[PDB]
Amino acid sequence: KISLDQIDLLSTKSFPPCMRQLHKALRENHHLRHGGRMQYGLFLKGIGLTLEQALQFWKQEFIKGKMDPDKFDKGYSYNIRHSFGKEGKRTDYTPFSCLKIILSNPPSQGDYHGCPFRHSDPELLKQKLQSYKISPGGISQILDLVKGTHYQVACQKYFEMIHNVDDCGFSLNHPNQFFCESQRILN
RNA sequence: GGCGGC
DNA sequence: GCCGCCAACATA
Ligand code: SF4
Ligand SMILES: [Mg+2]
């Protein structure tokens, strides 16, 4: 039901901070390192894209990287299809959970994957939070949680703020959950 | 990105 | 250089 020329907006309204960053990095650089391609690609599949849309979405953005639209089909296409279970063993991989994103494959320079509340240093997180136009009160309420290592809670706090609600009404532990609960309120 | 094949 | 096959796992 979801369409491609609708993602840029969705990233702002319903994507949790991690996926939002990942999308922005993708649009600005026209590319993403492995870690991000994994985290974001499966998220996109979790929200609804089909294999046709995924290949389109990724190809389109990588051509802007000015690379051979063939060098794309060469490497990148097979792996996208394998994500959707259409190659090898044929496993329709479930998208990543929070605990996994937070406790594993920590990001390095050049990477945008991971959990902002956990991998972005307090000072850079605050700037992001401010860029998302989050009230200095909640931003302060989030940083606290972060300092207490309650990353998922800090994210729920971010959810409640961009949605103008008192209680998100669910315990967060998976990015696509954050998306669904958001779409519930907006759509 | 890793592992694997030439 | 060319190429294949992997990982995940919430979820009302
Ligand atoms: S808490 Fe879970 S969802 Fe919110 S950002 Fe960290 S990872 Fe993405
Ligand atoms: Mg590569």
Structure description:
Helix content is 63%, strand content 0%. The protein has eleven helices and no strands. The chain has helices at 7-13, 17-29, 34-47, 51-63, 69-83, 98-103, 116-119, 122-131, 136-147, 151-162, 175-186. Bound molecules: iron/sulfur cluster and magnesium ion. Residues 16-18, 98, 101, 115-117, 151-152, 155, 175, 178 line the site of iron/sulfur cluster (SF4). It binds a DNA/RNA duplex (6 and 12 nucleotides) through helix 3, helix 5 and helix 11. Keywords: 4Fe-4S, DNA replication, DNA-binding, Iron, Iron-sulfur, Metal-binding, Phosphoprotein, Primosome.
Distance between the termini: 12 Å
Structural shape: globular
| The number of domains | 1
Sketch the topology as an H/E string, one letter per element. HHHHHHHHHHH
The radius of gyration computed from the alpha-carbon positions, rounded to a whole number of angstroms, is 17 Å
The tally of strands reads 0
Number of helices: 11
Q: Which molecules are bound in this entry?
A: iron/sulfur cluster, magnesium ion
- Characterize the biggest β-sheet: none
Q: Approximately how much helix is present in the residues?
A: 55-70%
Strand fraction equals: under 5%
Structural class: mainly alpha
Binding site for [4Fe-4S] cluster: 18, 98, 115, 155
Region (RNA:DNA duplex-binding): 31-173
Protein name: DNA primase large subunit
Family: Belongs to the eukaryotic-type primase large subunit family.
